[PDB]
Amino acid sequence: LKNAKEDAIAELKKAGITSDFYFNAINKAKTVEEVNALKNEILKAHA
Questions:
Q1: All domains of the chain, ordered by start, with CATH?
Q2: Closest to 1 measured CA to CA, from 28, 22, 23, 19
C-alpha cells in the first residue's frame, strides 16, 4: 500500500495532475484497488 500511492501520485504528476485533495484521497486510500481506482478515475476524467 505504501509505494503504490507514491507511484500513483508520481504517475499523476507525469499525467499533468498538480491538484493537491486528490493527493491527500490517494494518501487516504484504504486499499490498493482504491488507489488504482482513484488514479484511473482522475486520468480518465482529465482525458
A1: 2-46 (1.10.8.40)
A2: 28
